[PDB]
Write a protein that binds this ligand. Structure first.
Ligand SMILES: Nc1ncnc2c1ncn2[C@@H]1O[C@H](C[C@@H](N)CC[C@H](N)C(=O)O)[C@@H](O)[C@H]1O
Length: 184
């Protein structure tokens, strides 16, 4: 089931996927429909957590985001992300191989505008709760920053920390999508 970029300059162009448990195309089409309805991506900086194939970040990249930081701990997955960045031939992509919770913990001096996260099933939801909290204090978020998390309906829902305003939860087949934005 080889996936392809949905919208943007790279619309239609194919990207590769590792082995894994990746996002369905309707989930990706819908997430960007939701996000792009309420923000324009052009000039926006993006953080893609547990990037896997990079499909989500390559999508935002295609639709005009300025930069995407892909964070992914598996080396074969990081290689797949790099191949895909090359095949699409778009600028602004940076790749950071490492443990997502370690990277988020280490902080940053420049906030992003959209955080994309697809945590694998070995990650517990309460630990994802901790990453969302860290996004707020460790410099990753600014006022208006959107966060989106994809999980299996099997998984326990997220508990968002103060300072975030939840958007309406969505479900697609057996996948839950949670969205919020920073208030600051
Ligand atoms: N601490 C971790 N940090 C970064 N990546 C991880 C970590 N734990 C597991 N992963 C990887 O995160 C990815 C989770 C995937 N479901 C993401 C899929 C991706 N969004 C896609 O549809 O292509 C897998 O590639 C894991 O190897």
């Amino acid at each position: 089931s080889m996936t392809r970029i949905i919208g943007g300059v790279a619309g239609g162009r194919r990207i590769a996927v590792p082995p894994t448990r990746p996002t369905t195309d309707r989930v990706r089409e819908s997430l960007f429909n939701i996000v792009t309805a309420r923000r324009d991506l052009t000039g926006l900086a993006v953080l893609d957590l547990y990037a896997g194939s990079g499909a989500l970040g390559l999508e935002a990249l295609s639709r005009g985001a300025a930069s995407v930081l892909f964070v992914e701990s598996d080396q074969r997955s990081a290689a797949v992300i790099a191949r895909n960045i090359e095949a699409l031939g778009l600028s602004g992509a940076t790749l950071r191989r490492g443990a997502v919770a370690a990277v988020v913990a280490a902080g940053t001096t420049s906030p992003v505008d959209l955080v994309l996260a697809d945590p694998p099933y070995n990650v517990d939801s309460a630990d994802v709760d901790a990453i969302l909290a860290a996004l707020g204090t460790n410099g990753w978020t600014r006022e208006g920053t959107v966060a989106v998390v994809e999980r299996a309906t099997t998984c326990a829902p997220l508990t968002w920390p103060e300072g975030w305003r939840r958007w309406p939860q969505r479900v697609y087949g057996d996948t839950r999508l949670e969205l919020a934005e920073r208030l600051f």
